[PDB]
Amino acid sequence: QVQLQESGPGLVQPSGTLSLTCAVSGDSISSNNWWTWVRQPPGKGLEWIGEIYQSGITKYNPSLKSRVSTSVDKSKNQFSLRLSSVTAADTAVYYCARSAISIFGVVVLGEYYYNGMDVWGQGTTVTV
Amino acid sequence: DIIGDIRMAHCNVSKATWNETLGKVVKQLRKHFGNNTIIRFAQSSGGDLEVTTHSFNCGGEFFYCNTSGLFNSTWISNDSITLP
Amino acid sequence: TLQCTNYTPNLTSMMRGELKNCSFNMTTELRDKKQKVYSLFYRLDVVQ
Amino acid sequence: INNKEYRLINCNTSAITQACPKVSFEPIPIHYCAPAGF
Amino acid sequence: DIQMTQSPASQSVSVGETVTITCRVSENIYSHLAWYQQKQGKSPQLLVYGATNLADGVPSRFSGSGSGTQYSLKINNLQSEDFGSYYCQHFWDAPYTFGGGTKLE
Ligand SMILES: *[C@@H]1O[C@H](CO)[C@@H](O[C@@H]2O[C@H](CO)[C@@H](O[C@@H]3O[C@H](CO[C@H]4O[C@H](CO)[C@@H](O)[C@H](O)[C@@H]4O)[C@@H](O)[C@H](O[C@H]4O[C@H](CO)[C@@H](O)[C@H](O)[C@@H]4O[C@H]4O[C@H](CO)[C@@H](O)[C@H](O)[C@@H]4O)[C@@H]3O)[C@H](O)[C@H]2NC(C)=O)[C@H](O)[C@H]1NC(C)=O
Ligand SMILES: *[C@@H]1O[C@H](CO)[C@@H](O[C@@H]2O[C@H](CO)[C@@H](O[C@@H]3O[C@H](CO)[C@@H](O)[C@H](O[C@H]4O[C@H](CO)[C@@H](O)[C@H](O)[C@@H]4O)[C@@H]3O)[C@H](O)[C@H]2NC(C)=O)[C@H](O)[C@H]1NC(C)=O
Ligand SMILES: *[C@@H]1O[C@H](CO)[C@@H](O[C@@H]2O[C@H](CO)[C@@H](O)[C@H](O)[C@H]2NC(C)=O)[C@H](O)[C@H]1NC(C)=O
Ligand SMILES: *[C@@H]1O[C@H](CO)[C@@H](O)[C@H](O)[C@H]1NC(C)=O
Ligand SMILES: *[C@@H]1O[C@H](CO)[C@@H](O)[C@H](O)[C@H]1NC(C)=O
Ligand SMILES: *[C@@H]1O[C@H](CO)[C@@H](O)[C@H](O)[C@H]1NC(C)=O
Ligand SMILES: *[C@@H]1O[C@H](CO)[C@@H](O)[C@H](O)[C@H]1NC(C)=O
Ligand SMILES: *[C@@H]1O[C@H](CO)[C@@H](O)[C@H](O)[C@H]1NC(C)=O
Ligand SMILES: *[C@@H]1O[C@H](CO)[C@@H](O)[C@H](O)[C@H]1NC(C)=O
């Protein structure tokens, strides 16, 4: 029964860096899931930010070129984003979610498929 | 046909053993090129798969393993590595 | 000449595009007859 | 195999070589000789 | 990158009617698609995973269908609680782009 909750205080100034941490409770982060972040600007559609696995393998949206990094901490059951060089277009509600996968082979070889972003968190509003 | 799921052939080398092996190789290379010389390992470049990959016969099948996870590092003076 | 399609086109693993289901007209014991054969080939063994 | 359709008996297992018609099959006596020292 | 298009842009329907939302993709994604429901300010919830498998805990009135480059979500006997935004996401290739979304009112 995963209960995700974002923190990540807002009011970040232009040219600064975001630090958004999603807490995981009710499970560990070593399960067969990718931890994912998405973005929803105030009145725009829903954008994908990126995913990190329990091993530190990451995937990012190419639009955030050299701007975003993700990390996990197994001792806290936490994961977070560090989005650099914010301007003004990054004001949005940010969400974390547990993207479930079905694994049939070796994860580093892509031998898995996605079962949808189950158990979304409540979201954190970030302004710039 | 293939029964069951389709999976990729691969080889596993542990990280600790390989890292110790490279440390020893660098230690010996520094005896020919001198100390305080940076030793960098990198993946192979061009040519046919016979020379760009690790070719071998495994049980009658011919494997061509990438190895670019085994040779990338710069040496300045159970957690396996899977090679497609 | 082989007539090939993708064996499992819905994979998302590193084998997408590898293993083609190729059909061909193969010879048989008698010189008058032909046999239609379907087989799987690796991408690296088959040239378009 | 199924005028009726037939095949040569060898098609199931082997190829046939036609023996040369000018080579006789009549046995010729062969004398076996030991090498020196035997 | 793959482009995801969702249409109609919006609908205005009554309670009890059946509606269909359709997602069109520039490439064949072999049913690696998922259908999310965003309940007017709440976090999106997963309705269909795998294009044609009902998500656990979702009412049976939500049923996905589709193949190839055309996928749709059919909502039978639409209720008041089902009004909100609907989104489609391709899991075929990264970035797992999210369709612009449709508003059901
Ligand atoms: C080199 O080192 C790597 C690690 O660095 C190692 O990778 C591991 O390989 C094995 C075998 O290739 C992988 O095993 C798979 O693991 C998943 C996940 O297992 C966890 O979660 C399940 C949840 O049910 C637990 O039961 C389990 O105990 C673990 O906690 C399994 O889901 C896999 O099983 C599926 O595939 C099998 C075939 O390989 C089927 O027999 C099995 O029935 C499962 O198939 C079913 O489910 C599928 C998914 O829904 C479905 O598509 C099928 O059609 C079917 O319904 C399997 O046990 C392991 O995960 C790899 N680990 C990592 C980290 O990637 C290499 O094996 C190693 N190689 C060498 C040579 O040393
Ligand atoms: C470096 O040395 C190691 C150790 O010798 C070697 O690994 C060994 O390879 C042999 C040959 O593949 C393995 O022996 C096989 O084991 C399987 C077990 O299921 C058997 O089924 C095999 O028998 C079949 O295949 C034979 C033909 O090879 C047939 O004659 C037979 O009738 C069967 O059809 C065979 O016995 C051996 O098990 C491994 N060793 C280990 C520990 O796995 C390795 O390959 C060498 N490196 C290189 C590059 O060659
Ligand atoms: C072995 O794998 C490496 C990657 O681990 C391959 O190098 C990559 O090649 C792609 C193009 O196909 C580039 O976009 C990546 O940036 C490369 N990565 C690195 C680290 O160089 C390499 O080509 C593979 N070799 C063979 C023979 O398949
Ligand atoms: C290889 O397999 C053996 C079991 O047969 C295991 O003990 C060993 O750790 C494995 N080595 C690697 C590098 O995975
Ligand atoms: C692994 O190799 C790196 C060199 O890139 C070295 O700095 C590190 O200490 C090594 N780790 C172990 C456990 O040997
Ligand atoms: C470093 O190189 C010098 C030669 O210039 C050699 O005499 C010395 O023993 C080397 N030291 C080590 C630790 O290898
Ligand atoms: C891996 O190789 C790339 C160049 O292909 C290099 O930039 C990178 O630093 C290497 N990784 C490490 C850990 O050195
Ligand atoms: C096999 O031969 C037939 C004609 O006898 C032809 O129509 C067919 O396309 C051929 N198939 C392949 C795979 O070449
Ligand atoms: C074909 O050969 C097999 C053995 O190779 C034999 O058992 C079979 O009877 C043969 N077929 C005919 C029609 O004689």
Side-chain angles (χ1 to χ4, degrees), chain E residues 1-2 22 57:
Chain E
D1 292 344
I2 297 169
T22 293

Side-chain angles (χ1 to χ4, degrees), chain E residues 31-92:
Chain E
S31 301
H32 292 269
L33 173 129
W35 276 110
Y36 297 82
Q37 181 181 30
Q38 181 168 41
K39 295 182 179 180
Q40 302 179 42
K42 301 296 187 182
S43 298
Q45 305 298 309
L46 177 63
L47 313 163
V48 176
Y49 74 86
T52 67
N53 297 322
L54 182 65
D56 189 355
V58 178
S60 65
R61 65 180 176 273
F62 291 90
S63 178
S65 68
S67 70
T69 57
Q70 181 170 334
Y71 301 88
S72 64
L73 174 65
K74 182 178 284 186
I75 305 171
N76 292 308
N77 194 29
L78 183 68
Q79 300 300 309
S80 294
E81 294 79 12
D82 296 333
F83 291 119
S85 296
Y86 287 75
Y87 296 94
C88 54
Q89 191 183 7
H90 83 261
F91 289 121
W92 187 239

Side-chain angles (χ1 to χ4, degrees), chain B residues 1-3 6-9 49 61 84, chain C residues 7-8 11 13-15 18-19 40 44:
Chain B
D1 208 337
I2 302 173
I3 298 166
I6 307 304
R7 285 90 56 84
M8 176 171 273
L49 292 176
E61 295 289 0
Chain C
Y7 173 60
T8 54
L11 296 174
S13 75
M14 290 177 70
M15 291 183 73
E18 185 172 286
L19 294 173
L40 301 177
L44 294 173

Side-chain angles (χ1 to χ4, degrees), chain C residues 1-3 23-25 36:
Chain C
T1 304
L2 306 176
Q3 294 177 25
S23 63
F24 52 93
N25 287 292
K36 185 180 285 184

Side-chain angles (χ1 to χ4, degrees), chain B residues 41 43 68 71-74:
Chain B
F41 295 101
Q43 70 179 55
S68 90
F71 292 104
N72 197 20
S73 54
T74 298

